């Protein structure tokens, strides 16, 4: 099917152990990031190859050891499926070293490992992630061939540093300025130039930090696989038809592995059996075979039988895989609050189809210019129940497409009457209360108006934060596996930090909150 | 609105009601029977917990709890069912008309006070709590007690007593040869008299058409999903209820019946060791997960504790401009947050102030949402909603907060890379012409779920033993015929402009 190979290069130098008082050393942050990556790649049960190379250790072990070159570099784990052994190595039996290692030499070793181990299996996505602080001497002699080989072999490169271009994942500044060293500046310039050469002005977006990487899912950016495509034909009438492909842009993620019930003593599934039995509403508890049960439905004060075969024969039937545009309506007539369903579809033109792409682009541009949306009928297949949804244009400089979201039926709307609050006299706030609320809102604003471009920048973007439940589950499972007899650990501090707003808003929202408290009488009743 | 709904149908059984003026016109008695059947069907579908009763007055035979003469209570106040519908249909046809005449009789004296008294007695015989007490009087006569004034005064007194008690009465006047004059005698009996409904009526009542309009949709009374706690701070706290203004409609769950006798069958489950053969409880079981060759064992309580971050409720985090809330960032249906005030006093004023200030500043409140215990927290945005009412002061959008779930990073998926292809101005103009041709106004309730409607029709056919189930026309079809007839030659021009001749889509 699909497979990818990843090499994690980790610094082990003495500088890695340095830690400013009140702050965690970069070694701990790198260990946490690598542990998160390995947990995601192992508990997800995906066929991906992972290798780990430690540069900066006392010893030396690598294929490039013919002479006195590339010293203080050890290939801790070759290219193989990530088992628990890698987790134990990452957690317990890996300690900081004392001898510095060349970053360029470590990159050379990683690239050679990628090239050599990519003979048996087939990899379509080769990635190398370098974790370092750029505080060691290095030589640029091999840089040109490094870039040439990276471009020729189609190898993706990512960098993680203690600082960006204090609490972990706090949505705030990290590594305050004026602390970087001259050698760190030089290393930063070299990595910046390398990334610019590789990605072509996008490389600056591939240089993350441990604090950001802990809450951005950036490690798996180049590893995650694209979803399958749903082909269909958008038909406006009985003649016009455009071949289109729909993907699931947004869909709630759930754990695929399911807890298995096993016996308390033998810890085996075989010694557990679940049986379903049916009996009549009588004291004698008469037994009835599963084949003597008929499906029925309640009609009010009575139950009418409805056989499964009868239901299948009489059920509503329609042609499967239909994407028909019922009509076009003003975008204002469709409101977000009425959106239904558990998914959002992104519809593009059929791949490698110029005419379909042109037609879809024309439709999207016309809808955008007229400020309209298309009310359409959608059905995944024959069995899927027909749905009425709204498709609206989505035009971006990178790409343009349609966004489809289900709409509610006349039976799915609830008519609830709520007492008016504007005309109410018993709950009319006073001017002081309104002023206090305004001050609180102003103080707690999560968006900043950058005047350099006069744009709204989000200080607490919740869309990019990963789901904490998966990380918590992985941490607890790892703790139970490594320690078979021990209570589960508490929630990680960085998880809480990433789920909380920056300290700036909390500090600035003290006096307004006190004013709200003193100007609002609240008492439990 | 707390309680049930009680409806009593009073069908007059005089001679005039059994005669039809013109041909091809159903007699008023049959029309009343059809209206009652339609109401029964609508109640069965929408809400079967209500109570409906059918009482006939003016018949020769009498059946009442007091032994009043010339009054028959065909069906006492009880939940609707197929048996009552069939019993009513038995009188539907002309042969049913003959059966009703033979087994019930017609053309006898009656007193409106007596029928009102028996209706009140029926109302007082219901042990359940009744939110609405209503009576419907199906009669084409407007001057019943024209030959006696004492009966008129007795009926007036009884109607006044019923009105004082809380009984709400309607007169479903039917077609009459001469004409119906509500102002003559019935004006003083109706609970509410409209100024328009004063002239002589030469046709059927407008309420009959509304009653005959069958409705197929479950009606749910207002109910808060959860009375959660909003915490602007660890000390500042308010109570807010959560509602689902939009909820998916699912068909009623199937029930298992015994084929031999068609009775409910109880379903039970058990777990036991294959070796010891003894019953086991959830507390005597462990959860296992196998990853490769390793096995991890955790207790059920530990697994529940895994997904535990904070106590249930809403925790405020900050305010964000509405421009940053993307329309396509939709994961789950939005909810409605409204102040409760039944738990903590003074929350309503704070909620109103926050609503008006957010509307003024156009900022949505970001919050952390934990609907229940042992549930991972989510990030939600509360957008203030302005109370919107259409003409004639009817509310269409209540005031409160709209809670929209913000998708997480994992919930987002990356689309395959595509190469942009701009469309020329001519093609865009042609598409604009097509769209303008296919213009149409959209409303929230312009479509029906074909599956649910078909299921309801099939259930109706099965219950009533009808010959065939009336096919339900589905409005979800694109009616390509009309679209093709309207577009004209635009489609061909668009295809020529865009689609090459050797394409064959």
């Amino acid at each position: 099917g699909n497979k990818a190979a990843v090499v994690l290069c980790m610094d082990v130098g003495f500088t890695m152990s340095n830690s400013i008082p009140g702050i965690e050393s970069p070694f701990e942050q790198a260990k946490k990031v690598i542990t998160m990556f390995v947990q995601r790649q192992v508990f997800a049960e995906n066929k991906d190859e992972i290798a780990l190379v430690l540069f900066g250790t006392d010893g030396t072990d690598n294929p490039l050891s013919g002479g006195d070159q590339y010293q203080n570099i050890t290939v801790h784990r070759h290219l193989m499926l990530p088992d628990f052994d890698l987790l134990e190595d990452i957690e317990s039996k890996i300690q900081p070293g004392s001898q510095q290692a060349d970053f360029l030499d470590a990159l050379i070793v990683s690239m050679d490992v990628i090239q050599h181990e990519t003979i048996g299996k087939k990899f379509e996505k080769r990635h190398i992630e370098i974790f370092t602080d750029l505080s060691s001497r290095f030589s640029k002699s091999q840089l040109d061939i490094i870039i040439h080989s990276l471009k020729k072999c189609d190898i993706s490169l990512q960098f993680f540093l203690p600082f960006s271009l204090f609490r972990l994942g706090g949505h705030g500044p990290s590594f305050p300025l004026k602390g970087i060293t001259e050698q760190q500046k030089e290393g930063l310039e070299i990595v910046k130039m390398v990334m610019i050469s590789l990605e072509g002005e996008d490389g600056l977006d591939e240089i993350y930090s441990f604090s950001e990487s802990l809450r951005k899912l950036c490690v798996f950016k180049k590893i995650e696989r694209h979803s399958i495509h749903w082909p269909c034909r958008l038909t406006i009438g009985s003649n016009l038809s455009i071949r289109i492909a729909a993907y699931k842009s947004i869909l709630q993620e759930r754990v695929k592995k399911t807890w298995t019930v096993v016996d308390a003593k033998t810890l085996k599934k075989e010694d557990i059996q679940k049986e379903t039995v049916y009996c009549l509403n009588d004291d004698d508890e008469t037994e009835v075979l599963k084949e003597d049960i008929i499906q029925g439905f309640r009609y009010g004060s009575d139950i009418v039988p409805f056989s499964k075969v009868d239901e299948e024969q009489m059920k509503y039937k329609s042609e499967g895989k239909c994407f028909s545009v019922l009509g076009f309506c003003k975008s204002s007539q469709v409101q977000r609050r009425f959106f239904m369903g558990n998914q959002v579809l992104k519809v593009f033109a059929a791949r490698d189809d110029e005419a379909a792409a042109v037609a879809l682009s024309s439709l999207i541009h016309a809808l955008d210019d007229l400020d309209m949306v298309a009310i359409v009928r959608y059905a995944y297949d024959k069995r899927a129940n027909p749905q009425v949804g709204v498709a609206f244009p989505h035009i971006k400089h990178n790409y343009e497409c349609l966004v489809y979201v289900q709409l509610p039926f006349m039976e799915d709307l609830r008519q609830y009457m709520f007492s008016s609050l504007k005309n109410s006299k018993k709950y009319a706030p006073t001017e002081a209360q309104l002023n206090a609320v305004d001050a609180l809102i102003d103080s707690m604003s999560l968006a900043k108006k950058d005047e350099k471009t006069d744009t709204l920048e989000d200080l607490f973007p919740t869309t990019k934060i990963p789901n904490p439940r998966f990380q918590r589950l992985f941490q607890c499972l790892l703790h139970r596996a490594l320690h078979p007899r021990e209570p589960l650990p508490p929630i990680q501090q960085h998880i809480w930090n990433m789920l909380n707003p920056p300290a700036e808003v909390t500090t600035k929202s003290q006096i307004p909150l006190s004013k709200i408290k003193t100007l609002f009488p609240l008492i439990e009743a | 609105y707390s309680g049930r709904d009680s409806l009593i149908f009073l069908v007059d059984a005089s001679k005039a009601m059994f005669e039809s003026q013109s041909e091809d016109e159903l007699t008023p008695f049959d029309m009343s029977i059809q209206c009652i059947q339609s109401v029964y069907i609508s109640k069965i579908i929408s809400s079967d917990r209500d109570l409906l009763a059918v009482v006939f007055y003016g018949t020769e035979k009498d059946k009442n709890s007091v032994n009043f003469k010339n009054i028959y209570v065909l069906q006492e106040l009880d939940n609707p069912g197929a048996k009552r519908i069939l019993e009513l249909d038995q009188f539907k046809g002309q042969q049913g008309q003959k059966r009703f005449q033979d087994m019930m009789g017609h053309g006898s004296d009656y007193s409106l006070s007596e029928v009102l008294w028996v209706c009140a007695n029926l109302f007082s015989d219901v042990q359940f709590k009744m939110s609405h007490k209503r009576i419907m009087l199906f009669t084409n006569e407007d001057n019943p007690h024209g030959n006696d004034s004492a009966k008129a005064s007795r009926a007036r007194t009884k109607a006044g007593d019923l009105r004082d008690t809380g009984i709400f009465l309607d007169l479903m006047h039917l077609k009459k040869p001469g004409g119906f004059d509500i102002s003559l005698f019935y004006r003083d009996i109706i609970s509410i008299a409209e100024d328009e409904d004063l002239r002589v009526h030469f046709e059927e009542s407008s309420k009959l058409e509304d009653l005959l309009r069958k409705v197929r949709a479950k009606e749910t009374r207002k109910r808060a999903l959860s009375r959660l706690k909003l915490k602007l701070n660890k000390d500042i706290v308010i109570s807010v209820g959560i509602y689902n203004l939009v909820q998916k409609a699912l068909k009623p769950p199937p029930i298992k019946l015994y084929r031999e006798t068609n009775e409910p069958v109880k379903t039970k489950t058990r777990t036991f060791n294959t070796s010891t053969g003894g019953l086991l409880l959830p507390s005597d079981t462990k959860r296992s997960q196998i990853y490769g060759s390793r096995q991890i064992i955790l207790e059920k309580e530990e697994t529940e504790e895994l997904k535990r971050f904070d106590d249930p409720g809403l925790m405020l985090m900050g305010f964000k401009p509405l421009v940053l809330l993307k329309k396509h960032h939709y994961l789950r249906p939005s909810l409605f947050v409204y102040p409760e005030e039944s738990l903590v006093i003074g929350s309503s004023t704070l909620f109103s102030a926050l609503l008006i200030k957010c509307l003024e500043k156009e900022v949505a409140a970001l919050c952390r949402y934990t609907p229940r215990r042992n549930i991972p927290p989510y990030f939600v945005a509360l957008v203030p909603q302005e109370e919107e009412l259409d003409d004639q002061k009817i509310q269409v959008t209540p005031p409160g907060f709209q809670l929209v779930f913000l998708p997480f990073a994992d919930d987002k998926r990356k689309m395959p890379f595509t190469e942009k292809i701009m469309a020329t101005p001519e093609q865009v103009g042609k598409m604009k012409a097509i769209v303008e041709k296919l213009r149409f106004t959209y409303r929230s309730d312009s479509f029906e779920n074909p599956v649910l409607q078909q299921h309801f029709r099939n259930l109706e056919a099965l219950a009533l033993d009808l010959m065939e189930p009336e096919q339900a026309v589905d409005l979800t079809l694109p009616k390509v015929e009309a679209m093709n007839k309207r577009l004209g030659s635009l489609v061909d021009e668009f295809k020529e402009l865009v689609y090459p001749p050797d394409y064959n889509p």
Partner: peptide, 23 residues
Amino acid sequence: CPGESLINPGFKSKKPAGGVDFD
């Protein structure tokens, strides 16, 4: 209270679904 559903008191009457009516 015009528009109240006679069958279901307390619930506003709901117009039958008109489908797509082109202007």
